[PDB]
Amino acid sequence: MQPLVFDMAYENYMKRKELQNTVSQLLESEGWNRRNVDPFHIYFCNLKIDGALHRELVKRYQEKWDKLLLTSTEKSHVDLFPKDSIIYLTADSPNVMTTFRHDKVYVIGSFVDKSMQPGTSLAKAKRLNLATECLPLDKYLQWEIGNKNLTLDQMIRILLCLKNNGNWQEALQFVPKR
Ligand SMILES: C[S@@+](CC[C@H](N)C(=O)[O-])C[C@H]1O[C@@H](n2cnc3c(N)ncnc32)[C@H](O)[C@@H]1O
């Protein structure tokens, strides 16, 4: 089964409100995955034991934390999968995605910043020499803009649709317009 990584290396950038939002978005994402008959194997990487995120899950969502269908680890995506197979997703990337690939491990940053902290994830990728891509939002949604920095549950639904052989118009229905 194809892995999909949520990178938990952003905790230091967030306040109590935004960390909470991140946790809400991750729970929602795992739920969309459980609905699908051809799901991803979800990995929570860089999840520091007894950090703010792990503590938030354990103190405030213990019942829900014990039943998620995923693998969580302190290790990095680069410690587990070969660098050649990694693609870090970020709206700041200069490479526009054209093709969903079944032999790649996509990485999504676990970060709610309200577009106030650009480049953050692009740099975390460059520093380890990882390939990056952005979603083709301009190409397939001229005007209707909104902000191009989507939520974590939006990203998984798009990628699920493409994984299950949907075209770009179908996949991008999950993007709120205006
Ligand atoms: C709210 S965004 C975070 C924006 C943050 N300032 C950053 O530096 O990425 C949440 C995550 O979803 C992914 N993402 C969001 N919108 C995307 C897009 N248009 N293309 C590719 N990845 C996207 C990225 O992995 C990003 O880390």
Swiss-Prot record:
Effect after changing T71A: In COXPD30; decreased protein abundance; impaired mitochondrial tRNA processing; has no effect on steady-state mitochondrial-mRNA and mitochondrial-tRNA levels but indirectly impairs mitochondrial translation
Cell location: Mitochondrion matrix, Mitochondrion nucleoid
SAM-dependent MTase TRM10-type domain boundaries: 2-178
Membrane-spanning segments: none
Disorder named in the UniProt entry: Combined oxidative phosphorylation deficiency 30: An autosomal recessive, severe mitochondrial disease characterized by lactic acidosis, hypotonia, feeding difficulties, deafness, and respiratory failure with fatal issue. Patient skeletal muscle cells show decreased activities of mitochondrial complexes I, III and IV.
General function of this protein: Mitochondrial tRNA N(1)-methyltransferase involved in mitochondrial tRNA maturation. Component of mitochondrial ribonuclease P, a complex composed of TRMT10C/MRPP1, HSD17B10/MRPP2 and PRORP/MRPP3, which cleaves tRNA molecules in their 5'-ends. Together with HSD17B10/MRPP2, forms a subcomplex of the mitochondrial ribonuclease P, named MRPP1-MRPP2 subcomplex, which displays functions that are independent of the ribonuclease P activity.
Family: Belongs to the class IV-like SAM-binding methyltransferase superfamily. TRM10 family.
Subunit structure: Component of mitochondrial ribonuclease P, a complex composed of TRMT10C/MRPP1, HSD17B10/MRPP2 and PRORP/MRPP3. Interacts with HSD17B10/MRPP2; forming the MRPP1-MRPP2 subcomplex of the mitochondrial ribonuclease P complex. Interacts with GRSF1.
Name this polypeptide is given: tRNA methyltransferase 10 homolog C
Origin species: Homo sapiens
Gene assigned in the entry: TRMT10C
Segment of the intact protein contained: 203 to 379 of 403
